[PDB]
Structures are given as structure tokens and as C-alpha cells.
Amino acid sequence: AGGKVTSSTGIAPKRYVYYPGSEELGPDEIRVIACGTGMPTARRAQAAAAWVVELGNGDKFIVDIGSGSMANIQSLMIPANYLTKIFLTHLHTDHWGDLVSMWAGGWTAGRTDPLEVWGPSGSREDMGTKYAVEHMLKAYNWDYMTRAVTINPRPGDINVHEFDYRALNEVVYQENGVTFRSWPCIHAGDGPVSFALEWNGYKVVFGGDTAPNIWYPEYAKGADLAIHECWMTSDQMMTKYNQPAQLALRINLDFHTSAQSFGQIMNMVQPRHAVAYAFFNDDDTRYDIYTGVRENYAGPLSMATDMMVWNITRDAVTERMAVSPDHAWDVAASEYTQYILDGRLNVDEANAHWKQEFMG
Amino acid sequence: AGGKVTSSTGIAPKRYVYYPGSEELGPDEIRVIACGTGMPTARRAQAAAAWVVELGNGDKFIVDIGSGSMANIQSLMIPANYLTKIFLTHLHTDHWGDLVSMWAGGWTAGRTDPLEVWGPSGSREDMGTKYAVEHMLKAYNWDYMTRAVTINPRPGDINVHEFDYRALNEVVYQENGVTFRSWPCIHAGDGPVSFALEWNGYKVVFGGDTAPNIWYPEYAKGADLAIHECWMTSDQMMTKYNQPAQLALRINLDFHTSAQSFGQIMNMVQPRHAVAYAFFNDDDTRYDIYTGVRENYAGPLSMATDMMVWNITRDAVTERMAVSPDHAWDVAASEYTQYILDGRLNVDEANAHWKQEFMG
Amino acid sequence: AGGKVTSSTGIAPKRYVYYPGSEELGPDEIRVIACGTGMPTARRAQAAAAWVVELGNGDKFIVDIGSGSMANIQSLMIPANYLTKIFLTHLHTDHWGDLVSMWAGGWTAGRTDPLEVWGPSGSREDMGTKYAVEHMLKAYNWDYMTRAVTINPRPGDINVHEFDYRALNEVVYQENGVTFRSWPCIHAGDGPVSFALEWNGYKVVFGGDTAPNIWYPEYAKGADLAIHECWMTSDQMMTKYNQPAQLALRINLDFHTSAQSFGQIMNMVQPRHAVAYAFFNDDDTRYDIYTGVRENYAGPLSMATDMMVWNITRDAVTERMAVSPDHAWDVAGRASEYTQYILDGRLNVDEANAHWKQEFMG
Amino acid sequence: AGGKVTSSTGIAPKRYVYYPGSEELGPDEIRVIACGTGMPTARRAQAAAAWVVELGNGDKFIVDIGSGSMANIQSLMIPANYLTKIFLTHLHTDHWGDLVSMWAGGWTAGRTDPLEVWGPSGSREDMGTKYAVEHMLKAYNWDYMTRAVTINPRPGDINVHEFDYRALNEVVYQENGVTFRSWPCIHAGDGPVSFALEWNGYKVVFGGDTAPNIWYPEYAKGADLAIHECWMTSDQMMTKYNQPAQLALRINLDFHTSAQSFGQIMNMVQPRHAVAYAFFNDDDTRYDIYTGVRENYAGPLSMATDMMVWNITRDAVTERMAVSPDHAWDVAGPASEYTQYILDGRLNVDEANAHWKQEFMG
Ligand SMILES: [Zn+2]
Ligand SMILES: [Zn+2]
Ligand SMILES: [Zn+2]
Ligand SMILES: [Zn+2]
């Protein structure tokens, strides 16, 4: 597997696992990274939905940032500064739960620019992202204000860029050649939207969560990498959750997007590479799902789990697995009252030795 | 290692690892599990500050619920209804940033009763727990309201218990013979507490975060298990973060408790078992931080890391590691317009085959 | 998942993962753990072929103990005294490589009984398991002998039970209502076999390695669990190894059972549950190997990986993943080879130890 | 931590982890991977003792290669044909046990060259390395002869270079500016030796296993990277294994090198970077072992675990963790034993295979 090693001291070229930080990115390359691939419940194996896009121009975007995902992203050896721009498909906890870890993380890590979040609005004001993020920052006021004694604020504020969720394929973004176009989803209630990044002959479709809609097959068409929701079987639902045979069925026909329906949809889209996510990829579950997609779609497919990579070049769409550090490191008025400051225990004696050495 | 097997087919007694869900709790026993141990930065090896505490009476608490920790908490195979009661040592994102995941996740899981959150105030309204939770709830108002349509809204409530943070070893919880006292800590700004849980002759202190203070050594005294802040050395702060000498020195005095500071307090508390946490537990870090302590403290110590489980009985406080599933499962007006509902693609065909087959 | 938790302080019943040590085995129960599911080449994620079998009568068996398999076998919290019977499907390193780890290992851990090894004959004396095991024990004579000074030599023996590789589903082991049958495979050269375990009306079959043969479909028939080679797709053979098209083809027809061949074999046998192993279980191999079998076989299947476990009861063959300590420990259940030339090289370490030596002696 | 990123599309320099295959080794640089730090029992967390060296010249050695070390070694993305030369400290299974996965593996991992194995003699022929390997090849006879049939058997040769164990720092290897010297060790029985690697004024000592001996401290002097046995405290011997204090107390004074002896030795040696191994590095064990070193040694210290790497440059000795593939694949470098009683067993699967064969061949 991977390229042929030439010299004993020489670097293995075209490695068959992706080491984040180790590889140059082509001007005519994209590098996508599943930093989140599972849904409702948490699990070391699968963070909540989160993707890292890396364009050869230098522009990098996080599309969804759910609970768990921050751990994987931080393993990518990418400084805080470069990951400022965030794109949410809906306001489910497991799509932007970990914005605050980023928000707070990056600020302590030395991020200089404020996070820019694009999201869908709601049917009313309190159902949108402008509201959601506005209340987040209020929620974490005790964090914000304390930190904003010792660190310049600006990297604390969040420039939100809300749009109309109802809008069919309209332009939500356009800088440095990169375009994002959002369109609606039929999931839980009004607001949820699917994205389509377009840049340098390349098209990448983020499906977020949706029961099958007529806006995906249309605006997806002829994409390098197309990601869409693709769910457990109605059998597996009964097994795991103890569901009965009417709820189990409907969940795959009404509320969510089946495998067998995920297939038909991509068959319509004809992407360079289709990507099925948002299911617990386990030894007892993953297979039956793959046999669904196959019924009605026979093109290049990735059954997504955490830290799966796509290198979109001209010639090919190559899937690999990232192998990244678990012991990950970041890479490069007073909120005290005199009632708290007058408590400081004397440790001047306990610490005199190490200090002395440290100061000589 | 562990108990002596007494039959081929029988269970291994006093096993050398803790297998979550596999062991009965005794009546005069306490299980504390570290589900978070690792400062603000994200990494799979170490979730943010989170502890699960099981008492023999049948009560169970969570003390801090920082980003990531829900992946460790959920692996303990505990029905979400038993984990309703949550004590917050403060409102850093790395202490309560995964309550949201608990809130939403646990409600899909099947929590029937609301979440109960014990936290401090600030030195004004918009710096305390009552304010952060109500603004966290409004933050996720789309998630709340969409789910409410299809699941009774009762569990989606959070009952907030603001305590006064100023208070100096004063009761904040007294139910079923279990008594939580708080006291202030010196960290970021006014607000952060430590917790003393008392029950059936046991005492378990949760430090949280604190520069050395005159209250912890007094109020934690003789604790069966004593958890305190322990930072990484002022060389280590230069090595990893590129920090200057002047700053790195300061950090292990003003901002955080040194391993040496940590040693003094533990000398002055003389607990049955000490625990250092909050430092990154690595090959290249752990040994100088462990030594830092040994300058002053000599008795029993754990160097904390995710899924360390303490067993507190009359005779011993025994250290082990929990071995738990990464592929974890849970254990037992509309917000749609007719503009979105119209959008449904037709997949009666593609789903026909499996649909007919499942129904018999 | 699993069973409903009925008390706060009590035990989770029927847990969805298998914690080894943690479950009692009922008398009509069979537990099978995959301790090695991997190809010829080493990898942490997958040990070479190994299987641990637990029958509810108290009897246990390892079928194959290939390279890297002991790390998984040790993780099951079974005392060495309980794992002394080892069956080999052939003498590929990838199938008995770690025999010498269990032998030397267990003898430290404190095993009292010799190891017992059933293995095929060859066409001739020096292609069989008696010859193999004789010359392993010669290969590791410095360990056998040095260890024998300090530890009783009895358990450092290995009684070999060589059977006839040519024999068509004949008994190789009959003991305490347990039967092992062997039949031939078509693999590397003459030697290799499959096994059928017959106990309490249960039939577990360990296929080993073999190009599709006429013996497996016949004898395995109606197995409770039937374990069979399931190779990686010729396409993947090109991609991964840069194999020229026409060679890759030959491998999936001639030298190893392809997924469709496995799919055909398992329709004929009609097992309660069918296991594919041998192949590298990756995010970019497993699925088309599943596709392959599903073309030809429709009933209950597992796609093997390390620490996969089957419990066989009258009512079910349930598949879980085991969750097992990486930081594993052993669970408890003649003249000197020194000359004074080497003994006169010791260092005086009375000073530096004094402090821990004083304290520890109180 | 590590070097600064100064480009968005760029390679991040001086990374705080080591990504095997990803780093260019310099002329004035040695790279030392622990491919195995473990004890006599199996655990996934720690293979039995093994080491890989890669020298700035291009030369690459394995020092010891114990059971379950081949996973970690395969994870390094080094072609098999670059890991030809093997040195054994002793004939403990936990030190050479995975020479047979190297031999069978490497062959199918692209080794065209035969194995060179340097090991020590014992008190007699049957206790040397010549004999061990002789009989190892004889163990896997079935493996050899089937494998070789239609192939060149060259890389199937293990050339053993056996030296005297009682020879005091006498050269056992001199090739392309690399020197290996050996002295004895006190351990089990006359035979175990400890190597020193010399090259470009670099000294890298490979202890092996030994109770404190007078030799190591002399010949390991001014080491760049001095590796040595370090045992668990006599406490951790009573806790886990249930030893009486007497035996527990003695284990650490008589048989094995105590944390305090380890430190007494490295103070005598004065190495640029010492390396304790050969203990189960666990959350309840590692701390009482560091301390017992620190008693009598204050130099740069590594507490060894599987996949730790040391970069030996002119300016420093930098310790790191290797981040590597669990899904390991080999990387490409630059009379038949069948009777017709077995080849007459081949099943018809021409139907089943028809669909995929047609697709693949077009
Ligand atoms: Zn959703
Ligand atoms: Zn804090
Ligand atoms: Zn074979
Ligand atoms: Zn040894």
C-alpha cells in the first residue's frame, strides 16, 4: 500500500494513511476530513457531525461543529487563525455543540480574528442562528468576561451571517473564488439547509440531515464529493432501541433518509464520489446499510467514520484514513473582588527550590 | 492481577480493570470515575473536567461536564435518568460545555425527568449559573422546540439551583443523607467553587480550578479522596506553547496551582487518597509533575487521566482504569410549514423491495 | 442496546459489548472469541488467525494461535491452567507462530500442566506437527533449560497429538463428550485441515485456510457457527500490492477462496451463522467482500475482526465486540546454567537500594 | 508544541509526534524506535522487547524482536528488504519469538535478501543462537518447503553469526563505519549479552536483561542513548501477582535490576539520555519506578513504552511518541508438495464467480 520507498533515509511518498501536518496541499487539490460522523448519542468512536475542508488557495472552512468533534480537529495540526469560518446546516446540538470549545479553545490558543458563523434562519426570530449564537455568547458570559481581562476581546465576538433557509440554491458566500450555495432540508422543522462549495472546477455537497427532498438531487448534480445522511435499517432500530415494527419502519420512510433512498438519490446526482454518514458505523450495522446504497447506486461510495480523508484532484477522488495524535497539542476591568483576592494561600516556601533553579 | 478465579465457567472476581456496568455497588461504597481531566484544549486522550460519582444508597452525581466528557460518561452504561443531578465548580466551557449534549442526547436516549443543575452565582446577575443555563437553553431554542413537537417537553427542562459563591463551607445540597458544601476558588474572576460531598461516613472533594487558597486545606481536611488542580511546569509551558520565562514563571504562581503548591495543600489536608488533575497526562509531562508533588506530599496519590475509577470502601481507596466501549449505545404546534413538507422526493420504488420483506 | 437496567446500584444485564471475565457461562452455552482474523503480514488492528472456544461444561480450546494472537488471548482474563489444549489447522507461522508465547508465557504466569497440541501430519515425517513441535522445542532450548532451574519442568513439556491430514471428517479428539473432526484443505502443499467441534448437539467449524474444496460444504453442513477463509477482491490485490491484473485474478480462483466462492460454500452448508475471516478488515476492503458473499449467500453472517465474540445458545448465535484491557495482566486460577565466571560480574548495589530496602522490610 | 506553521497549504515542521515514513533522517542523526518494551506476558499496550535503529548513513538494525513486536515494526512504513540485519541480546522468547513472523512475513513483505542474525553462544552448542535458528527453520519446515516450490528460496535463508558471550567488549560486527561490541549479562543462565552501537562518534547501548553487573557501567560510558532493564517495585510484585514479601524483596535485588540499581548504574555511565524499559508501564506502576530511578539519577530519563522514538543529533536527544497505522500494510521497496488426492478435492465455483470475473477481465 502507498508509493515505493526509494532511499533508506528518504521519505515514503504517497502514504496510504493521512498524517495531518505531514503533507503539502496542491493548488488544484481539496482535502476533506470527517471530524464528525455519528448522531444523537456520544461515543469515543464517533464525534457529532463535523467536517474540515482545505482548499489549495489557502481558504479552510468547518461545515458543522457538533459535540465530540473538537478532539479530532485539534489533532489536525492546523493553527487557530486558519479555521475562523464556520457553516451550520441546522442548530441541532450535534452540528454546532462544539462551536464554544472552538470559540473558547482558539481564544486561549491565540486566534486573532473573530469566528464568522453562517447558518440558516428560522420561520421566526428565535428559531434562527443570529439568535442561537447571540444566546450562546450570553450563556458563556462568565468565560467571555474573565478571559477578556487578560486577552484582547475581538477574537471573542462572533460575526454571524444568517440567510433565508427557504432559498433554492442562492449564493450565501463568495470570496477568493470559493462559492457556497445553501438549499432547504425536510427534518424536524423549518431551518435545516444543505450546502454546495464550488471552487476551481471542484464542487463539494454537504447534505447535513434531511428526509429525502427534491432540492438535493437537482443542486447536487455532477459533484466531486457529495455527502448526504444515510440511516440504520428498520431491523437495527428494533435490535438496539427495542422499537416496534410500525415506528421502526416509518423512521426510515418519513423522518429520515434510508440507505435504499440514499442510493436512488446519488444515482440521480452522479457524483465523482458519494459519502454516506450520520450512522453508528459498527461491525453489526455498517454492512446492511452498504447493501442498501448498492441496490440503486453503484458509483464510488465512502461509508464515513471519524478521520476519513478525501483528496479531490483532477485524476481521482481518493479516500484514506487519517492517523492523528490522541495526545494532541495546540500548534502555533477586573472580574476579581477583594473578597476572592484576600484568600490567596502562602506557598512561597513550598516553591522556593524549583523557582531558584528555574530563575538560574 | 485481580481476584483468584474459582471456576472455568464462573465470573472473575475483584477484576484488575473496571468494566462499566459489570460490577454491583455495595451499601457503604463510593465509585468516583474521571470522565474529564484535561484543560481547555481538545484531544481524544483527555476530555475536559468531568466526574461521575456513584454512592451505595443508589444516588449518582456528575461534578463538572466539560467538552468531550459525554463520550466517557455515556460509556458507563448508566440510563440517562440516573444522571439528572449536575454540580458545576464554574462556567469555563471546559467545565459545563457538554451539559447541552447531556440535555439533548439524554432526551433522545430517554430521560423522563428534568436536569437539576447546582452552580455558583457571580458578583452580579449575568456572571452566575442561573443566567448561563437560561441563555444556554435559548441558545439551543431551535433544538428544544423541534424535539418538543415529537417528545413530551418535561425532560427538556433544566431546574437551576443557584448557590451563593461567596459562601464559606455552607450546605448547597442536603437530600437522602447526602450533603454538598461549596467554598470559593481564585481563578479567572469571582465565582468558581470547590465541592465537599458527605455521605454515610465518606467525604469526596472536587477542587475544580484555583490558585492556592486558605479555604481548601481547611474545608477538604481528611477527605477520603481529594481532587485538586495540578498544572504543568514553567519549563513545559515554554517547551509546548513557546512562552517566555517571565510569563511561564508567573503562570505556576498567580494563575494556577503548581505541582509543589498541590503537594503543600495535600500535606495540609492529609486525605486517604489525593488526585492531581487538569494537566495534560503524557509520557513527557507526567513524571516532573509527579515529582513536583513528591517535594511536599508523600502519602497515596493518583496522576489523573480519563476513565480512572476510584473505589472508596472502609479498608481501602483502590485505583484502577475503566475499560469501556468506544462504540457506545444508550441503555434504557409543528415547526414545519407546508412549503417544506411539499418538498418530499418520492422513493416508494427504491424502498419497495426491503419494505415488503420487513413486513413479513 | 442489550438488556434493561433494573436497579441503580445493580449489574447491567445482557451487556451489548463483551467484557471478558465478566459473564458466567451457562451449561448449554458456547462462547467463541476471534483472537486473530488477519492476513499473512503483521498489524496491531488484527492478529494472525486465532480462536478461543468456551463450552459451558468448563472445557476450553484454542483453534490456531498465529503471530500476535497472545496479546488478545491474554486480554480474556483466563488462567493459563484452563487453556492447555491447542488445535492447529496448519503450520503456517500465521496459524501457530505464538504457540511459543503461550508456552513460555503461561509457564511464567504459573501453568502447572503441559500444553496439549493436535495438528495435521504431512505427506512425510518432516512436514507434520510432531516434527514441527519437536524442533520448536529444540529452537527455544536455552529458555526451556534456564527456566527449568527455577520453575518445575513438567508444564514446560508439549504433548503432541498428530492426526492423519488425509482423513475425511474422522475424529482427532474425543474426550468428556467433546469431539474434534478434521478434513483436508487445498493450501500451500499437503498438510492443512479444517475442524468440526461436536459438543452437546452443537457443531462449531473452524475452516482454517483452503481454496474451495468439496469436503467443507459436505461435513460443516448445518453448523451452529461455520468459519471460512474469505479473501480480499483481486481489484484490491492490484491497488494495495500493485499485482498485475492476470495474477490477481488467479489468487481469487486458485490459491484462496474469493467472497463469492465463500458465498457459494455457505449456501450449501446452511449454517445458523457464517463467519468470513483471514482478510484485512479496513474501511476500504470489508464492504465489497460483503457484497461478494451476498451475491451467493443470504442468511446470518459476521465479517470477522479481532475480539469479535459469538455466544451460541439453543435460541440464538449473538455477535458482540469484546472490550478487553490493553494493559493486560496474567489472572491467577537440575544443575545451574550459570558458571561462576558470569556470577562474579554482579555489582554491589547495597547503598542505592538501602532506603527502599529498610522501609519495605517493615 | 513542535515547529511553527508558516504556510496554510504547507508541511508543519518539527511535529510533536513522529509519523513513521514522514521524516527525512539526516547524515549526523540516529532514530531509535521502541517496537517493544513489555515483560514475559502478552498485552496489546506493550509488545515483548524489540528495537529498530535507522542511521544517517542508511543502515538499519533490529536489536531484539520478541513475540508481538512485528505489528509495531510493520507500522513504520519501512520495506522488509531494509530490515535484513537482526541482533539478539538473548534467546528468551520475549526477545526473538517474532524472528519467525519477520522471516515468513518479510518474505511476503518483499525481502529478496537472506536474514543476518547475530546472537550469543551459551555454555554449549544447544544453548547458542546458531542452534536455536537452525531448529526454528526446522520447526516451520512445512512453511519453508511449500512456500519455496515455484520461487527463489534465497531470502528464506537465515545466516547466523554466533559470537562468545564471555568476550568483554570484543567487536562482533564492523561494516560501513558501524561497530557493535558485546559484554555478558547476569540473567537466567550464561548467554545473555548487551550491545553498544558506535557510528559517527555516536554511542547507543542496548542493555537487554540483567541483574546489576560491573560490565555495563564501564563499556556504556558517555552513551548518547543508554537503554537498560528496570523492574517493578517489590510492592507492585505483592499487589498484582500475590508474592510473599521475601520473594518480592529478592526479585528486585538478586534476579533483576531494581529502579535504584538502574539509577546507580546510569549515574556511573553518565549518558546524554538514559532509557528504562522491561516493566509494564501502567497508571499504578510507572510512578514508583521513575522515583526509584530519581533517587540516584538526575540526567535526561525516558520511561519506555511501545512506539517511543529518540532523535540523536549533535545538539540534543529529543524524545517523542510515534503515531502509526493500526491498519498496517507492507510498503514496496526498490518437488511440489501437493499430491493429486488433495488437488482432486477442488470445488466447482465457476457459476458463483462468473459475474465478477467477467467485469474484472474488462
Ligand atoms: Zn438533525
Ligand atoms: Zn477553569
Ligand atoms: Zn494458511
Ligand atoms: Zn527476560
Residue numbers in the entry:
A (entry chain C), B (entry chain B): 2 to 333, 346 to 373
C (entry chain A): 2 to 334, 345 to 373
D (entry chain D): 2 to 335, 346 to 373
Excerpt from the publication:
PNGM-1 is derived from a metagenomic library from deep-sea sediments that predate the antibiotic era. PNGM-1 has both MBL and tRNase Z activities and is considered to be the evolutionary origin of B3 MBLs. The wild-type of PNGM-1 has two MBSs in its substrate-binding pocket, and each is occupied by a zinc ion. The zinc ion in the first MBS (Zn1) is coordinated by the residues His91, His93, His188, and Asp210; the zinc ion in the second MBS (Zn2), by Asp95, His96, His279, and Asp210.
His91 and His93 coordinate the zinc ion at Zn1, whereas His96 and His279 coordinate that at Zn2. The residues His93, Aps95, His279, and Asp210 occupy equatorial positions along the enzyme’s surface. In the structures of all PNGM-1 variants, except in that of H96A, the electron density corresponding to the catalytic water remains despite the complete or partial loss of a zinc ion. Each MBS of PNGM-1 is formed by four metal-coordinating residues, and the substitution of only one of these residues dramatically reduces the metal binding affinity of the enzyme.
